[PDB]
Protein backbone atom coordinates (compact mmCIF):
# COMPACT_ATOMS: atom_id res chain seq x y z
CA UNK A 1 0.00 0.00 0.00
CA UNK A 2 0.85 3.78 0.00
CA UNK A 3 0.37 4.12 3.84
CA UNK A 4 2.53 6.33 6.15
CA UNK A 5 3.56 4.96 9.56
CA UNK A 6 3.78 6.46 13.06
CA UNK A 7 6.94 4.90 14.63
CA UNK A 8 5.90 5.38 18.30
CA UNK A 9 2.24 4.23 17.90
CA UNK A 10 2.66 0.57 19.14
CA UNK A 11 4.75 1.70 22.20
CA UNK A 12 2.18 4.48 23.02
CA UNK A 13 -0.70 1.93 22.76
CA UNK A 14 1.12 -0.46 25.17
CA UNK A 15 1.92 2.41 27.58
CA UNK A 16 -1.84 3.30 27.72
CA UNK A 17 -2.87 -0.36 28.17
CA UNK A 18 -0.45 -0.51 31.16
CA UNK A 19 -2.04 2.75 32.55
CA UNK A 20 -5.47 1.03 32.31
CA UNK A 21 -4.06 -2.04 34.12
CA UNK A 22 -2.55 0.10 36.95
CA UNK A 23 -5.96 1.82 37.49
CA UNK A 24 -7.82 -1.55 37.11
CA UNK A 25 -9.84 -0.18 34.11
CA UNK A 26 -11.67 -2.75 31.89
CA UNK A 27 -9.63 -5.69 33.35
CA UNK A 28 -11.74 -8.82 32.70
CA UNK A 29 -9.81 -11.66 34.35
CA UNK A 30 -7.96 -12.56 37.56
CA UNK A 31 -4.97 -14.93 37.27
CA UNK A 32 -4.52 -16.92 40.49
CA UNK A 33 -0.92 -18.04 41.24
CA UNK A 34 -0.70 -19.93 44.58
CA UNK A 35 -2.21 -17.40 47.09
CA UNK A 36 -1.57 -14.37 44.79
CA UNK A 37 -4.10 -12.70 42.45
CA UNK A 38 -3.26 -10.67 39.31
CA UNK A 39 -5.83 -8.63 37.38
CA UNK A 40 -5.32 -8.22 33.62
CA UNK A 41 -6.90 -7.81 30.16
CA UNK A 42 -7.53 -11.14 28.37
CA UNK A 43 -6.56 -9.61 24.96
CA UNK A 44 -3.13 -8.47 26.24
CA UNK A 45 -2.50 -11.90 27.87
CA UNK A 46 -3.39 -13.63 24.53
CA UNK A 47 -1.21 -11.22 22.51
CA UNK A 48 1.85 -12.12 24.71
CA UNK A 49 1.39 -15.79 25.64
CA UNK A 50 0.77 -19.00 23.66
CA UNK A 51 -0.85 -20.50 26.79
CA UNK A 52 -3.37 -17.61 27.27
CA UNK A 53 -4.01 -17.51 23.50
CA UNK A 54 -5.05 -21.23 23.70
CA UNK A 55 -7.13 -20.68 26.90
CA UNK A 56 -9.15 -17.68 25.74
CA UNK A 57 -9.85 -19.02 22.19
CA UNK A 58 -11.52 -22.01 23.86
CA UNK A 59 -15.34 -21.69 23.57
CA UNK A 60 -15.81 -22.52 27.34
CA UNK A 61 -12.72 -20.92 28.96
CA UNK A 62 -13.15 -17.61 27.00
CA UNK A 63 -16.04 -16.78 29.44
CA UNK A 64 -14.15 -17.48 32.72
CA UNK A 65 -13.37 -14.49 35.00
CA UNK A 66 -10.84 -16.54 37.09
CA UNK A 67 -7.91 -18.70 35.79
CA UNK A 68 -5.84 -20.81 38.22
CA UNK A 69 -2.27 -21.57 37.13
CA UNK A 70 -0.38 -24.81 37.89
CA UNK A 71 0.67 -24.82 41.65
CA UNK A 72 4.36 -25.18 40.56
CA UNK A 73 4.21 -21.60 39.12
CA UNK A 74 6.02 -19.04 41.27
CA UNK A 75 4.00 -15.75 41.90
CA UNK A 76 7.14 -13.55 41.58
CA UNK A 77 8.08 -15.13 38.21
CA UNK A 78 4.50 -14.52 36.99
CA UNK A 79 4.52 -10.88 38.24
CA UNK A 80 7.83 -10.17 36.34
CA UNK A 81 6.35 -11.70 33.16
CA UNK A 82 3.01 -9.82 33.48
CA UNK A 83 5.03 -6.56 33.84
CA UNK A 84 7.01 -7.53 30.66
CA UNK A 85 3.73 -8.16 28.76
CA UNK A 86 2.55 -4.60 29.49
CA UNK A 87 5.92 -2.75 29.16
CA UNK A 88 8.43 -4.75 26.94
CA UNK A 89 10.78 -4.55 30.03
CA UNK A 90 12.03 -7.73 31.73
CA UNK A 91 13.41 -7.56 35.31
CA UNK A 92 15.83 -10.48 34.86
CA UNK A 93 18.15 -11.07 37.88
CA UNK A 94 20.46 -13.90 39.14
CA UNK A 95 17.98 -14.64 41.96
CA UNK A 96 14.89 -14.88 39.72
CA UNK A 97 16.16 -16.17 36.30
CA UNK A 98 15.30 -19.86 36.97
CA UNK A 99 11.70 -19.00 38.11
CA UNK A 100 11.30 -16.52 35.18
CA UNK A 101 12.48 -19.10 32.55
CA UNK A 102 10.21 -21.89 33.99
CA UNK A 103 7.19 -19.49 34.06
CA UNK A 104 7.95 -18.27 30.45
CA UNK A 105 8.16 -21.92 29.23
CA UNK A 106 4.74 -22.66 30.87
CA UNK A 107 3.21 -19.42 29.48
CA UNK A 108 4.78 -20.14 26.03
CA UNK A 109 6.62 -16.77 25.71
CA UNK A 110 9.32 -17.85 23.22
CA UNK A 111 11.42 -14.62 23.17
CA UNK A 112 11.68 -14.55 27.02
CA UNK A 113 12.67 -18.29 27.08
CA UNK A 114 15.39 -17.49 24.45
CA UNK A 115 16.99 -14.61 26.46
CA UNK A 116 16.90 -16.68 29.73
CA UNK A 117 18.66 -19.62 27.97
CA UNK A 118 21.35 -17.21 26.61
CA UNK A 119 21.90 -15.48 30.01
CA UNK A 120 22.17 -18.91 31.77
CA UNK A 121 24.65 -20.20 29.08
CA UNK A 122 26.88 -17.09 29.70
CA UNK A 123 27.13 -17.89 33.46
CA UNK B 124 15.80 -0.24 37.07
CA UNK B 125 18.21 -2.94 35.69
CA UNK B 126 15.60 -4.30 33.16
CA UNK B 127 16.41 -5.53 29.59
CA UNK B 128 14.03 -4.61 26.76
CA UNK B 129 12.61 -6.51 23.76
CA UNK B 130 12.53 -3.93 20.89
CA UNK B 131 9.78 -5.66 18.82
CA UNK B 132 7.44 -6.50 21.77
CA UNK B 133 4.98 -3.52 21.40
CA UNK B 134 4.69 -4.05 17.57
CA UNK B 135 4.16 -7.85 18.06
CA UNK B 136 1.44 -7.17 20.70
CA UNK B 137 -0.37 -4.77 18.29
CA UNK B 138 -0.04 -7.26 15.39
CA UNK B 139 -1.74 -9.96 17.58
CA UNK B 140 -4.49 -7.56 18.72
CA UNK B 141 -5.20 -6.85 15.01
CA UNK B 142 -5.32 -10.67 14.34
CA UNK B 143 -7.93 -10.96 17.14
CA UNK B 144 -9.93 -8.07 15.59
CA UNK B 145 -9.85 -9.69 12.09
CA UNK B 146 -11.20 -12.99 13.56
CA UNK B 147 -13.70 -11.06 15.79
CA UNK B 148 -12.14 -12.58 18.99
CA UNK B 149 -13.01 -10.91 22.36
CA UNK B 150 -14.36 -7.75 20.60
CA UNK B 151 -16.70 -6.09 23.14
CA UNK B 152 -18.19 -3.10 21.30
CA UNK B 153 -19.73 -2.11 17.96
CA UNK B 154 -19.12 1.46 16.72
CA UNK B 155 -22.01 2.64 14.53
CA UNK B 156 -21.10 5.26 11.88
CA UNK B 157 -24.15 6.20 9.73
CA UNK B 158 -25.33 2.79 8.36
CA UNK B 159 -21.91 1.11 8.94
CA UNK B 160 -20.90 -1.07 11.93
CA UNK B 161 -17.33 -1.63 13.20
CA UNK B 162 -16.43 -4.23 15.84
CA UNK B 163 -13.47 -3.49 18.12
CA UNK B 164 -11.85 -3.89 21.57
CA UNK B 165 -12.73 -1.06 24.00
CA UNK B 166 -9.17 -1.09 25.49
CA UNK B 167 -7.53 -0.54 22.05
CA UNK B 168 -10.02 2.27 21.21
CA UNK B 169 -9.20 3.97 24.59
CA UNK B 170 -5.44 3.54 24.08
CA UNK B 171 -5.66 5.37 20.68
CA UNK B 172 -8.42 7.98 21.11
CA UNK B 173 -9.10 10.75 23.64
CA UNK B 174 -12.82 10.48 22.78
CA UNK B 175 -13.04 6.68 23.47
CA UNK B 176 -10.86 7.10 26.59
CA UNK B 177 -13.48 9.61 27.93
CA UNK B 178 -16.45 7.39 26.87
CA UNK B 179 -15.25 4.10 28.38
CA UNK B 180 -13.99 5.64 31.70
CA UNK B 181 -17.55 6.89 32.24
CA UNK B 182 -19.30 4.73 34.90
CA UNK B 183 -22.46 4.35 32.67
CA UNK B 184 -21.00 4.26 29.11
CA UNK B 185 -18.25 1.72 30.09
CA UNK B 186 -21.02 -0.99 30.05
CA UNK B 187 -22.50 -0.15 26.60
CA UNK B 188 -22.02 -2.73 23.79
CA UNK B 189 -23.07 -0.19 21.06
CA UNK B 190 -21.70 3.40 20.54
CA UNK B 191 -23.25 5.68 17.89
CA UNK B 192 -20.96 8.39 16.50
CA UNK B 193 -22.09 11.88 15.41
CA UNK B 194 -23.98 11.61 12.01
CA UNK B 195 -21.42 14.05 10.45
CA UNK B 196 -18.71 11.32 10.81
CA UNK B 197 -17.82 9.64 7.51
CA UNK B 198 -17.65 5.74 7.66
CA UNK B 199 -14.58 5.61 5.35
CA UNK B 200 -12.66 8.13 7.51
CA UNK B 201 -13.51 6.05 10.61
CA UNK B 202 -12.45 2.77 8.90
CA UNK B 203 -9.02 4.29 7.94
CA UNK B 204 -8.52 5.50 11.54
CA UNK B 205 -9.61 2.15 13.09
CA UNK B 206 -7.06 0.41 10.79
CA UNK B 207 -4.38 2.92 11.99
CA UNK B 208 -5.25 2.18 15.66
CA UNK B 209 -4.55 -1.54 15.14
CA UNK B 210 -1.53 -1.28 12.75
CA UNK B 211 0.28 2.16 13.13
CA UNK B 212 -0.35 2.53 9.32
CA UNK B 213 -2.41 5.44 7.97
CA UNK B 214 -3.92 5.22 4.44
CA UNK B 215 -3.80 8.99 3.81
CA UNK B 216 -4.81 10.02 0.23
CA UNK B 217 -5.82 13.28 -1.57
CA UNK B 218 -9.42 12.00 -1.82
CA UNK B 219 -9.77 11.09 1.89
CA UNK B 220 -7.49 13.57 3.79
CA UNK B 221 -10.30 16.04 4.68
CA UNK B 222 -12.59 13.23 6.04
CA UNK B 223 -9.60 11.60 7.88
CA UNK B 224 -8.55 14.93 9.56
CA UNK B 225 -12.19 15.76 10.62
CA UNK B 226 -12.66 12.20 12.04
CA UNK B 227 -9.24 12.36 13.87
CA UNK B 228 -10.20 15.76 15.41
CA UNK B 229 -13.54 14.26 16.64
CA UNK B 230 -11.80 11.09 17.94
CA UNK B 231 -9.03 13.25 19.55
CA UNK B 232 -6.08 11.47 17.83
CA UNK B 233 -3.51 14.29 18.10
CA UNK B 234 -0.66 12.71 16.04
CA UNK B 235 -3.02 11.94 13.08
CA UNK B 236 -4.44 15.54 13.20
CA UNK B 237 -0.79 16.85 13.13
CA UNK B 238 0.25 14.84 10.00
CA UNK B 239 -3.02 15.80 8.16
CA UNK B 240 -2.41 19.53 8.91
CA UNK B 241 1.21 19.21 7.60
CA UNK B 242 0.16 17.32 4.41
CA UNK B 243 -2.61 19.92 3.70
CA UNK B 244 -0.14 22.84 4.30
CA UNK B 245 2.29 21.28 1.70
CA UNK B 246 -0.47 21.25 -1.00
CA UNK C 247 5.90 9.59 10.62
CA UNK C 248 7.87 7.44 8.06
CA UNK C 249 7.52 5.55 4.74
CA UNK C 250 7.32 1.92 6.06
CA UNK D 251 17.00 -7.48 23.45
CA UNK D 252 18.66 -4.12 24.47
CA UNK D 253 19.68 -2.01 27.50
CA UNK D 254 16.83 0.61 27.47
Ligand SMILES: CN(C)c1ncc(Cl)c(Nc2ccc3c(c2)CC(=O)N3)n1
Pocket residue numbers: 046047048049050051053108109110111139140142143
Ligand atom coordinates in the same frame (compact mmCIF):
# COMPACT_ATOMS: atom_id res chain seq x y z
C1 LIG E 1 -0.69 -17.64 16.20
N1 LIG E 1 -1.80 -16.63 16.02
C2 LIG E 1 -2.53 -16.68 14.71
C3 LIG E 1 -2.13 -15.67 17.02
N2 LIG E 1 -3.19 -14.79 16.81
C4 LIG E 1 -3.55 -14.00 17.83
C5 LIG E 1 -2.90 -14.03 19.05
CL1 LIG E 1 -3.44 -13.08 20.28
C6 LIG E 1 -1.79 -14.93 19.21
N3 LIG E 1 -1.00 -14.89 20.31
C7 LIG E 1 0.05 -15.79 20.69
C8 LIG E 1 0.17 -17.14 20.26
C9 LIG E 1 1.36 -17.88 20.43
C10 LIG E 1 2.45 -17.21 21.06
C11 LIG E 1 2.35 -15.86 21.50
C12 LIG E 1 1.17 -15.13 21.34
C13 LIG E 1 3.66 -15.45 22.12
C14 LIG E 1 4.53 -16.71 21.94
O1 LIG E 1 5.71 -16.88 22.23
N4 LIG E 1 3.74 -17.71 21.32
N5 LIG E 1 -1.42 -15.73 18.19
Ligand SMILES: CN(C)c1ncc(Cl)c(Nc2ccc3c(c2)CC(=O)N3)n1
Pocket residue numbers: 016017019020169170171172173174176231232233234
Ligand atom coordinates in the same frame (compact mmCIF):
# COMPACT_ATOMS: atom_id res chain seq x y z
C1 LIG F 1 -4.30 10.50 29.69
N1 LIG F 1 -4.27 9.14 30.33
C2 LIG F 1 -3.84 9.09 31.76
C3 LIG F 1 -4.62 7.95 29.62
N2 LIG F 1 -4.62 6.73 30.27
C4 LIG F 1 -5.08 5.66 29.60
C5 LIG F 1 -5.53 5.76 28.30
CL1 LIG F 1 -6.16 4.42 27.56
C6 LIG F 1 -5.49 7.04 27.65
N3 LIG F 1 -5.76 7.17 26.33
C7 LIG F 1 -5.90 8.37 25.57
C8 LIG F 1 -6.24 9.65 26.09
C9 LIG F 1 -6.07 10.83 25.34
C10 LIG F 1 -5.55 10.71 24.03
C11 LIG F 1 -5.20 9.44 23.48
C12 LIG F 1 -5.37 8.26 24.22
C13 LIG F 1 -4.67 9.63 22.09
C14 LIG F 1 -4.73 11.17 21.92
O1 LIG F 1 -4.35 11.85 20.97
N4 LIG F 1 -5.27 11.73 23.10
N5 LIG F 1 -5.03 8.12 28.32
Ligand SMILES: [Cl-]
Pocket residue numbers: 048109110111112113
Ligand atom coordinates in the same frame (compact mmCIF):
# COMPACT_ATOMS: atom_id res chain seq x y z
CL1 LIG G 1 8.00 -13.34 24.52
Ligand SMILES: [Cl-]
Pocket residue numbers: 171232233234235236
Ligand atom coordinates in the same frame (compact mmCIF):
# COMPACT_ATOMS: atom_id res chain seq x y z
CL1 LIG H 1 -2.78 9.59 17.04
